[PDB]
RNA sequence: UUGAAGAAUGAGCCUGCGAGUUAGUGAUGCGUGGCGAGGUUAACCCGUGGUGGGGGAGUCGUAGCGAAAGCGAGUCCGAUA
RNA sequence: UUCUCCCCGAAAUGCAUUUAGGUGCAGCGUUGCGUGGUUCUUGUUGGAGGUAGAGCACUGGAUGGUCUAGGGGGCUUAUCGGCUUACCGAAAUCAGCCAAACUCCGAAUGCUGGCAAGUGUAGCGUGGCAGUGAGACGGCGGGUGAUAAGCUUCGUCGUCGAGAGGGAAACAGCCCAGAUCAUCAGCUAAGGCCCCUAAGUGGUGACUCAGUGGGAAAGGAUGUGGAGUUGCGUAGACAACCA
RNA sequence: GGGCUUAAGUUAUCCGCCGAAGCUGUGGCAACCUGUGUGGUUGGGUAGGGGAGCGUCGUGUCAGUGGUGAAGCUGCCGGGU
RNA sequence: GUCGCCUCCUAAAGGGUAACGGAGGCGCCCAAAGGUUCCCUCAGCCUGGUUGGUAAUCAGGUGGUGAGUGUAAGUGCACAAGGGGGCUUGACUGUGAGACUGACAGGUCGAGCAGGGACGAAAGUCGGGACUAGUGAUCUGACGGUGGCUUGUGGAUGCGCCGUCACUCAACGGAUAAAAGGUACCCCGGGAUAACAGGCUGAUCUUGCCCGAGCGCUCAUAGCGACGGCAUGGUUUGGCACCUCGAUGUCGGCUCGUCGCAUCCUGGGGCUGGAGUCGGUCCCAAGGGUUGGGCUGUUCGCCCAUUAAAGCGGCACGCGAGCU
RNA sequence: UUUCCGGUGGCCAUAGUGGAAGGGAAACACCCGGUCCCAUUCCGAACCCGGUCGUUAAGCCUUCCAACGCUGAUGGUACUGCACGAGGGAUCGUGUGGGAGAGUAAGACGCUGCCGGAAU
């Protein structure tokens, strides 16, 4: 799903270091 | 013996309990705290164990 | 639906070496719990009914080879 | 509640009211006071004048071990082990 | 389930349960008394191992080759015996392989002793009082599941829970960092410096022209820069143009 | 998000700065440790444990006070962690 | 289906470690299959040999563990713990330094000593079995022994102690000695937990795509697309149990629309074509339009008569404080 | 003292396996008997007893042979503690420590203690 894909891809932001709650 | 100079540059939060206990044994208590230790292999070992948290000099 | 013909297991028995090399022991102290003689009784070490190796005397535990066997000895304390 | 600004619950508003109490010479700690190898009374009696005095029956401490007879700084299992 | 502040500060685990949203015991909190480096970290020194990896000694799985017992098909024709065996083929052997329940091997770590140094005031004994025994996500190593789930169930560390502040547009669990109060001082962390928005429309050298940056696969494509190897070539190459 | 290729994109590198309740400076408070002239360490916090208090009502005692105005209510000006 | 116990794997080289994870076993057996002492070495293979064959018994050669082990599996065991003979009862009584392992109940090992034995020339070994399952707390009752106690005394009787017995208490830490069902007539915390919707996921479904065996007289690619491969969508069936159980009303029609384009018609264009007429297919394109009836509660579907056409989907499978 | 040999340990293949050559003074051994102790789940084969004639054929001993097996670095690689990083995702990379297995060069036809023997 689009929402799931965006949620998973949000972990690629700079301040996060490849990790994010709920992937 | 060259009197190693060790200062803490990163916090102990979220580090491993090994690393936190190593900092305690080195006597560092805050970020920016500095201690002087002899050029002894045990202290070199502590420094290399927490090498990502401290910097060392002479 | 379906079912499993498995799910049974035995309780943990807690085998293994209980006193490692150089560790000071008293007479009668258990050195290793085991099934079969993976370690044979050496000098100063007795073997029990369930193949437990225990100390026959005070001293330090060492692991070695006696002829062709892996053995556990208790060197008498200096 | 893993997680609530939550579209989970309750509350319209104010004022008043509304939930860890009390009784045991209960059990067990602690603080403190008294006395101390002793401590302490209960009922009850006297004080119609009370909160004071008497009352040591009891009760805890003073020796333990054993199922017990028993023995006792030992005792019990045991063979005076 | 009603006033305040000071100090410390959890658990959502194990075992058992007519038990599973309850409870007892242990774990973890606090506190009195006692014992004092016994704890912990690092170094050094010594132990037991069978995981990762790897391997084919074993047990299974397996590809091809050689070779072959022995089975199938034929005839001459068979009681044989022969031609065949151009078909099948155990085993053995050669070469390449596979494995949570394979191992001739075998780490890193971890665990556990001795010694040394460092160290908060850690550890331990024994009493008083608990709460908790519904966990969550992330990293790493696994099982269940479909190479699924913000899934489920373990190992381990972290945060959240019970954590404000900075970053992540917003955004319990990610990153930085643990808030004693005051300050219209300074330096930094992560992250940032065109404007929103504090600080560089920074310097120098490359690349991109797709708004790629600012989501995606098998596959496809004279996009573009750079680095090779190699064939042919002023015996005259590749195109274009006359037989 | 505006907008950005005339990078405000990617990348290598160099020089600066911004940036938190982190660190430092300064002032106040507090817990604990220590030889007791110093100083050191510490003070996010739910369930929960420990410690010390504020306010209300009654009451023993002492000192009182009140129609030259108590309680209560309600302003203002102050005080304490 | 499972519940206690044992072995292996999962288990991440100590120990421990969960799932309705993956494999199996146990509720015994043995008077020798226990103790001791001495002796022995297997399976397989090759050769020869009456019956006799792959394989009985025999001989020689080879062969170190691939046989064997009462019984699962692992760890062991060839020095044998495997095979055989002799003699035996230690498958003892009184004990247990010191440890292992559990929250505990508990589970396990054990040197040394005494008594009285077995075996061995002795050294020595023997408190069952190569090891680890073959088991059940307490209560209550029972039998044997003992004689501690006995309510005035002596008896008796009863009890205590020691040994032992009686539970598929198998839901195996064992609620009672004693127990099955119905509730749509039902009544009185949880979104800790199901049905509906939302969310995640995308197996399935769906829509594409890559490869091109083949089919298409001929001719992979007019048009098709085998075997395989890669994804989209989130509307199908599911998986999950995150939201709501101090209420998020659940099918179809009616009414009112709005949005997507994966276009039914109308508009445009390629390739084929295709004589023309028509068609079919890959692009563009969502402006407008997209009928009325029979059957069934239906969605779906079939049918009748039309039409330029009778599209597919989203909006809590749009829309019950709008209706049905 | 040395050499050689017989016993009895230790390391447990660098020692084994296989092939070749040679040796016995004491010793070991095969060998010769079974009368005697004793013995065969039959057998004086073995065990045991009595001899040491015969014999180095074998055991045993010495020398030689890397042939099978065994031993085996250095360097690299896998993996990995800690710290990070990159992909839509299976998964991958780097820093800092540790670091195999296999394979390669190579080693190796054993080493060592005590007692006894015959000679020196
Ligand atoms: Mg999808
Ligand atoms: Mg035994
Ligand atoms: Mg036994
Ligand atoms: Mg919830
Ligand atoms: Mg609300
Ligand atoms: Mg609201
Ligand atoms: Mg509720
Ligand atoms: Mg309400
Ligand atoms: Mg109210
Ligand atoms: Mg008296
Ligand atoms: Mg605190
Ligand atoms: Mg592997
Ligand atoms: Mg508890
Ligand atoms: Mg519970
Ligand atoms: Mg739980
Ligand atoms: Mg759970
Ligand atoms: Mg958990
Ligand atoms: Mg996790
Ligand atoms: Mg998995
Ligand atoms: Mg989860
Ligand atoms: Mg909570
Ligand atoms: Mg926290
Ligand atoms: Mg925060
Ligand atoms: Mg923030
Ligand atoms: Mg913010
Ligand atoms: Mg600055
Ligand atoms: Mg920075
Ligand atoms: Mg703003
Ligand atoms: Mg510029
Ligand atoms: Mg610039
Ligand atoms: Mg594009
Ligand atoms: Mg884009
Ligand atoms: Mg792409
Ligand atoms: Mg500041
Ligand atoms: Mg601060
Ligand atoms: Mg300061
Ligand atoms: Mg505090
Ligand atoms: Mg703080
Ligand atoms: Mg509290
Ligand atoms: Mg007056
Ligand atoms: Mg009053
Ligand atoms: Mg383990
Ligand atoms: Mg481990
Ligand atoms: Mg668990
Ligand atoms: Mg036997
Ligand atoms: Mg018995
Ligand atoms: Mg003991
Ligand atoms: Mg057991
Ligand atoms: Mg005896
Ligand atoms: Mg005798
Ligand atoms: Mg047996
Ligand atoms: Mg036996
Ligand atoms: Mg009962
Ligand atoms: Mg009487
Ligand atoms: Mg007895
Ligand atoms: Mg049970
Ligand atoms: Mg019962
Ligand atoms: Mg009815
Ligand atoms: Mg109800
Ligand atoms: Mg839920
Ligand atoms: Mg709940
Ligand atoms: Mg649902
Ligand atoms: Mg909803
Ligand atoms: Mg669904
Ligand atoms: Mg579910
Ligand atoms: Mg769950
Ligand atoms: Mg409501
Ligand atoms: Mg279109
Ligand atoms: Mg339309
Ligand atoms: Mg439009
Ligand atoms: Mg139908
Ligand atoms: Mg529609
Ligand atoms: Mg609906
Ligand atoms: Mg409505
Ligand atoms: Mg090697
Ligand atoms: Mg190597």
Q: Which nucleotide is at minimal CA–C1' distance from A2?
A: E215
- Whether residue C59 contacts residue C26, with contact meaning beta carbons closer than 8 Å, is answered with no
Cα–Cα distance measured from residue C44 to residue A7, given in angstroms and rounded to the nearest whole number: 66
Helices then strands, counting H and E runs in chain C, come out as 0, 8
Find tokens 């970020």 and name the residue.
Answer: B31
- Solved using: cryo-EM
Residue C32: beta bridge partners? C17, C53
Write out which nucleotides of chain E lie closer than 7 A to a protein Cβ. Answer: 40-44, 46-49, 110-114, 116-120, 137-139, 150, 157-159, 166-178, 189-192, 214-215
CA torsion B28-B33-B38-B41 (nearest 10°) is: 50
- Cα dihedral C54, C58, C56, C75 sign: positive
Q: Stated in angstroms, how far is B18 CA from E109 C1'?
A: 14
Note the resolution in Å, 1 decimal. Answer: 2.7
Chains contacting A (3+ CB pairs below 8 angstroms): none
Cα–Cα distance measured from residue C3 to residue B53, given in angstroms and rounded to the nearest whole number: 53
Burial of C54 (0-12, 13-18, 19+ CB in 10 A): buried
Neighbouring CB atoms inside 10 A of C24's CB total 12
- Whether residue B38 contacts residue B1, with contact meaning beta carbons closer than 8 Å, is answered with yes
Burial of B44 (0-12, 13-18, 19+ CB in 10 A): middle
Ligand 22 centroid–CA B13 distance in Å is: 10
H/E segment holding residue C59 = strand C59-66
- Cα dihedral C21, C23, C26, C32 sign: negative
CA-angle at C34, arms to C29 and C39, nearest 5°:
80
Write out which nucleotides of chain H lie closer than 7 A to a protein Cβ. Answer: 10-12, 82-89, 96-97
């Amino acid at each position: 799903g689009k929402t799931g894909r965006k949620r998973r891809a949000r972990r690629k932001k700079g301040a996060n270091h490849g990790k994010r709650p709920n992937a | 013996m060259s009197k190693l100079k060790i200062t803490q540059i990163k916090s102990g939060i979220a580090t491993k309990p090994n690393h936190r206990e190593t900092l305690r044994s080195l006597g560092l208590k805050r970020i920016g705290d500095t201690v002087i230790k002899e050029d002894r292999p045990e202290f070199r070992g502590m420094v290399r164990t927490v090498r990502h948290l401290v910097t060392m000099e002479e | 639906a379906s079912s499993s013909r498995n799910g049974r297991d035995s309780n943990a028995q807690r085998l293994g070496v209980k006193r490692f090399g150089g560790q000071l022991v008293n007479a009668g102290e258990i050195i290793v719990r085991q099934r079969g003689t993976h370690f044979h009784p050496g000098d100063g070490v007795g073997r029990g009914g369930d193949d437990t190796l225990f100390a026959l005397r005070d001293g330090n535990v060492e692991f070695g080879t006696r002829r062709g066997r892996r053995v556990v000895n208790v060197t008498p304390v200096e």
